[PDB]
From Swiss-Prot:
Gene3D superfamilies: 1.10.530.10. The active site is at residues 35, 52. In the egg white and polymorphonuclear leukocytes. One of its GO terms (molecular function) is identical protein binding. One of its GO terms (cellular component) is extracellular space. Lysozyme C is capable of both hydrolysis and transglycosylation; it also shows a slight esterase activity. It acts rapidly on both peptide-substituted and unsubstituted peptidoglycan, and slowly on chitin oligosaccharides. It catalyses: Hydrolysis of (1->4)-beta-linkages between N-acetylmuramic acid and N-acetyl-D-glucosamine residues in a peptidoglycan and between N-acetyl-D-glucosamine residues in chitodextrins. The lineage of its organism: Eukaryota, Metazoa, Chordata, Craniata, Vertebrata. Residues 1-129 form the C-type lysozyme domain. Substrate binds at residue 101. The gene is LYZ. It comes from Gallus gallus (Chicken). InterPro entries: Glyco_hydro_22, Glyco_hydro_22_CS, Glyco_hydro_22_lys, Lysozyme-like_dom_sf. Pfam families: Lys. Its EC number is 3.2.1.17. This is Lysozyme C.
Length: 129
């Protein structure tokens, strides 16, 4: 599923990301924009052999199981496929763990490089929320 911007904002809101770990909703929407272009089915193969899955590009190196990431963990306790779902619940719940892992949203390289410090209000402009 390719979410609209405001559609995604509403869903992330509902599931409790606005202010999660102190990160305003716009942070999360901006991160998803540059991680997945709002596409739940997005995947990305990393140099180390791990893969990123879903609208927040959750990495198989720690967070989900894909059966092809040697030495990896599954701290979110779910098959990486469950992160490609049209429904974002598994991705959000797992994102909550990731952002709690010590470095906040810096865990998403694209957030650090493209969203951090920017006008992330703008990502939820016009959105009936
Ligand atoms: Cl915001
Ligand atoms: Cl933080
Ligand atoms: Na894994």
């Amino acid at each position: 599923k390719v979410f609209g911007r405001c559609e995604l904002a509403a869903a992330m809101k509902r599931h409790g990301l606005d202010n999660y770990r102190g990160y305003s909703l716009g942070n999360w929407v901006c991160a998803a924009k540059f991680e997945s272009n709002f596409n739940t089915q997005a995947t990305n193969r990393n140099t180390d052999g791990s893969t990123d899955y879903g609208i927040l590009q959750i990495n198989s190196r720690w967070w989900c199981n894909d059966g092809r990431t040697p030495g990896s963990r599954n701290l979110c306790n779910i098959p990486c496929s469950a992160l490609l779902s049209s429904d974002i619940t598994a991705s959000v719940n797992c994102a909550k763990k990731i952002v709690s892992d010590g470095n906040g949203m810096n865990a998403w390289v694209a957030w650090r490089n493209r969203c951090k410090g920017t006008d992330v209000q703008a990502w939820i402009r016009g959105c009936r929320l």
